């Protein structure tokens, strides 16, 4: 057993890079996103902090997302969820409050 409360970010995924900085992911959005549906979720290892980042056409956004030190990842204006899997999938449905629903992952795919 190690030291960790709940989930510890899931690498396996495009729009889920628990390494990117924040800009790095927003520059990626620079790449893609047109229909105002691209997004990406990121995590951090400092004090449990996640934030969704989607672009509203040439206007990349970010949304803070955390829990109540309970494990339930939520959002003030956004919503509430168990994990970034639900908050993402859910939001994968709608915006729920975002600028616009989600439709595409930000992160990259290949090289060239």
């Amino acid at each position: 057993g190690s030291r960790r409360a709940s989930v510890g970010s899931h690498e396996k995924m495009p729009w889920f890079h628990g390494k990117i900085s924040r800009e790095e992911s927003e520059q990626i959005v620079l790449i893609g996103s047109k229909t105002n549906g691209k997004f990406l979720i990121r995590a951090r290892d400092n004090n449990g902090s996640y934030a969704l980042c989607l672009l509203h056409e040439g206007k990349v956004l970010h949304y803070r997302i955390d829990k109540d030190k309970t494990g339930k990842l939520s959002i003030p204006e956004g919503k509430k969820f168990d994990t970034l899997w639900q908050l993402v999938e859910h939001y994968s449905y709608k915006a729920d409050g975002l600028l616009r629903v989600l439709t595409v992952p930000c992160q990259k795919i290949g090289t060239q």
Binding site: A51, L61, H62, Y63, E77, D96, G97, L99
Partner: peptide, 5 residues
């Protein structure tokens, strides 16, 4: 840096 959800 967080829009308003």
């Amino acid at each position: 840096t967080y829009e308003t959800l």
